[PDB]
Design an enzyme around this catalytic site. Sequence first.
Site, PDB file in Angstrom:
ATOM      1  N   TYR A   8      50.096  43.771  44.924  1.00 36.96           N
ATOM      2  CA  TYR A   8      49.383  43.289  43.740  1.00 36.96           C
ATOM      3  C   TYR A   8      49.503  41.315  44.409  1.00 36.96           C
ATOM      4  CZ  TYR A   8      45.684  41.698  40.309  1.00 36.96           C
ATOM      5  OH  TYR A   8      45.092  40.986  39.758  1.00 36.96           O
ATOM      6  N   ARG A  14      45.789  42.150  36.806  1.00 43.87           N
ATOM      7  CA  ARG A  14      45.621  43.402  36.479  1.00 43.87           C
ATOM      8  C   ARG A  14      46.613  44.208  37.158  1.00 43.87           C
ATOM      9  NH1 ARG A  14      39.816  42.459  39.555  1.00 43.87           N
ATOM     10  NH2 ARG A  14      38.150  42.390  37.565  1.00 43.87           N
ATOM     11  N   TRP A 104      36.192  35.577  37.870  1.00 41.29           N
ATOM     12  CA  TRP A 104      37.447  34.835  38.778  1.00 41.29           C
ATOM     13  C   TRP A 104      37.515  34.535  40.771  1.00 41.29           C
ATOM     14  CZ3 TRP A 104      40.385  34.162  35.222  1.00 41.29           C
ATOM     15  CH2 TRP A 104      40.350  34.769  34.248  1.00 41.29           C
TER      16      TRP A 104
HETATM   17  N1  LIG Z   1      38.295  47.373  38.524  1.00 42.65           N
HETATM   18  C1  LIG Z   1      39.720  47.374  39.589  1.00 42.65           C
HETATM   19  C2  LIG Z   1      39.166  46.117  39.930  1.00 42.65           C
HETATM   20  C3  LIG Z   1      40.512  45.751  41.780  1.00 42.65           C
HETATM   21  C4  LIG Z   1      39.814  44.509  41.926  1.00 42.65           C
HETATM   22  O1  LIG Z   1      38.538  43.815  41.674  1.00 42.65           O
HETATM   23  N2  LIG Z   1      40.976  43.906  42.436  1.00 42.65           N
HETATM   24  C5  LIG Z   1      41.504  42.613  42.766  1.00 42.65           C
HETATM   25  C6  LIG Z   1      42.169  41.329  42.641  1.00 42.65           C
HETATM   26  S1  LIG Z   1      42.753  41.056  40.985  1.00 42.65           S
HETATM   27  C7  LIG Z   1      40.861  42.210  44.615  1.00 42.65           C
HETATM   28  O2  LIG Z   1      40.983  43.411  44.905  1.00 42.65           O
HETATM   29  N3  LIG Z   1      40.311  40.698  45.144  1.00 42.65           N
HETATM   30  C8  LIG Z   1      40.411  40.261  46.282  1.00 42.65           C
HETATM   31  C9  LIG Z   1      39.354  41.372  47.142  1.00 42.65           C
HETATM   32  O3  LIG Z   1      39.022  41.376  47.032  1.00 42.65           O
HETATM   33  O4  LIG Z   1      39.420  40.875  48.711  1.00 42.65           O
HETATM   34  C10 LIG Z   1      41.351  47.369  38.997  1.00 42.65           C
HETATM   35  O5  LIG Z   1      40.673  47.225  37.965  1.00 42.65           O
HETATM   36  O6  LIG Z   1      41.762  47.853  39.934  1.00 42.65           O
END
Ligand SMILES: N[C@@H](CCC(=O)N[C@@H](CS)C(=O)NCC(=O)O)C(=O)O
Lengths: 197, 198
Positions: A8, A14, A104
């Site tokens: 992460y 998360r 976000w």
């Molecule tokens: N509902 C999913 C959400 C996953 C998610 O959207 N994570 C974000 C980070 S908080 C992410 O991968 N963002 C970077 C991207 O989409 O490239 C979970 O809880 O794992």
Amino acid sequence: HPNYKLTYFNMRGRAEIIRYIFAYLDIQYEDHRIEQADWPEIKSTLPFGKIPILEVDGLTLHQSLAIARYLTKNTDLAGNTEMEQCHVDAIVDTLDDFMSCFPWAEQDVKEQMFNELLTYNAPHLMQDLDTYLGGREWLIGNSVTWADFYWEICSTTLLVFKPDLLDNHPRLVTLRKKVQAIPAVANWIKRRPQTKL
Amino acid sequence: PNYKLTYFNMRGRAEIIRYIFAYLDIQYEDHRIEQADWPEIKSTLPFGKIPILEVDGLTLHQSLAIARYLTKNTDLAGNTEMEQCHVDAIVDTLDDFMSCFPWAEKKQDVKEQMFNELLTYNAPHLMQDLDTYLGGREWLIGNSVTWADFYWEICSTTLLVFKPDLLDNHPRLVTLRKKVQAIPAVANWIKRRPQTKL
Ligand SMILES: N[C@@H](CCC(=O)N[C@@H](CS)C(=O)NCC(=O)O)C(=O)O
Ligand SMILES: O=C(NCCN1CCOCC1)c1ccc(-c2c(CO)ccc3ccccc23)cc1
Ligand SMILES: N[C@@H](CCC(=O)N[C@@H](CS)C(=O)NCC(=O)O)C(=O)O
Ligand SMILES: [Mg+2]
């Protein structure tokens, strides 16, 4: 006891619910925190291109709450009965629904949406959570569950943006402190990397 | 148990529960509220949201929490704990995407822009990831149908309303839809349920 590698960003975010569960169950894991610069490469190797992921003996799991539930299966954090497990799952999704409403990755429109959610919607949710808690010690049943963990995690983030979040809800403050006092959780809170979110 | 499901007259977020009841041949009251009664009924709900499921005087909420509860110890659950994780993950990935749409947006130009952006940019990536995840296998998880397959069919049915060409390059995902629709209990529900847009 399999090999666990959690991937992460360098934040609670998360991944934190998984980190609380590992701490409580005293499970060894690699807390792999990537920099935003390394993400493009990592993103391209993942089945669904989002984090957190948990590698379990090299097998990549995704979705933070799916992973959390998996790790709490057959543990005292899951809920004592099938019905309690449903109540736990429901509180978790209610919290996650609200946190997911925040844009976000959206300035201007982002700042407006944050203020609306925190000012007009968060207090309503806090009231419903307090009402659900109903003077009891934990959110579900007679002992701590990962719903209480997730409550403490989500409310910690909300407090960053809205310090008066729980000024009308002393019982919700008491629940936060109760979770924070659990020895394994307290130990992780004092030792984890200090990040804003 | 005396089951009473309360939701709008829509497939929406209640449909996954409706599929599970149908598949397991479990009798329930499919209560569909009146739009004029929504402002009043909202104040009785535990978190002001529907669906809820009443079970012998006890109120449950959150559609996927309820769906998971109803499939516990059934053939719709994953066969192993890791499979159950895969089911949960696929369901949340679908739910994340469907929840992005501004379903209640009053400003029509803003709604249409957001819908189009999600359908033309984000949706194709999700279909690609799901298709690759499925591969040449019979169902999404393991070697038999799970409620993840139900939820795929449910979500894609609605997406196809707004983007009919969504699966033109994903015949394996189309085949999966047809397989879920071919399950006797599911097919029976599909033909008997109220015909609504969403
Ligand atoms: N509902 C999913 C959400 C996953 C998610 O959207 N994570 C974000 C980070 S908080 C992410 O991968 N963002 C970077 C991207 O989409 O490239 C979970 O809880 O794992
Ligand atoms: O329009 C939707 N909901 C609000 C209904 N309003 C309430 C106020 O009065 C007028 C009616 C709605 C709900 C669910 C979904 C939905 C579908 C639709 O078939 C399918 C899958 C989903 C998965 C996750 C979340 C929503 C969905 C789409 C739109
Ligand atoms: N994640 C929840 C979401 C529930 C939800 O937001 N339901 C909508 C209807 S689709 C609702 O009650 N909104 C009406 C309102 O907030 O007034 C679930 O799946 O049950
Ligand atoms: Mg969710």
